[PDB]
Design a protein around this ligand. Sequence first.
Ligand SMILES: [Zn+2]
Ligand SMILES: [Zn+2]
Ligand SMILES: [Zn+2]
Ligand SMILES: [Zn+2]
Ligand SMILES: [Zn+2]
Ligand SMILES: [Zn+2]
Lengths: 26, 26, 26, 26
Amino acid sequence: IEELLRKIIEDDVRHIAELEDIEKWL
Amino acid sequence: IEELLRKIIEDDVRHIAELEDIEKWL
Amino acid sequence: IEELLRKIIEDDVRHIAELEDIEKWL
Amino acid sequence: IEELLRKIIEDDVRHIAELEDIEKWL
Ligand SMILES: [Zn+2]
Ligand SMILES: [Zn+2]
Ligand SMILES: [Zn+2]
Ligand SMILES: [Zn+2]
Ligand SMILES: [Zn+2]
Ligand SMILES: [Zn+2]
């Protein structure tokens, strides 16, 4: 479970970075 | 942007499945 | 923890619904 | 759309904090 949670966290960090970028492009 | 958002959607689909699985394990 | 996980799942379900909508608007 | 994406970002910020907290509890 620890490893699963770490992977989900890394995904959400990526989402924050990606959505902040889209925000800027818009 | 559309391709990006598709990838995010796919991630969230995986997150719901994994977190639901974790919730049952616990 | 169970309740926290359920809330995160509900958020991600909303994200899927919202991003599918944005997808369509774009 | 920009307002929507901001709300998603805010959610993911909460998710990273909560999942990290869960990861420590476990
Ligand atoms: Zn996310
Ligand atoms: Zn960038
Ligand atoms: Zn997620
Ligand atoms: Zn999400
Ligand atoms: Zn709608
Ligand atoms: Zn999330």
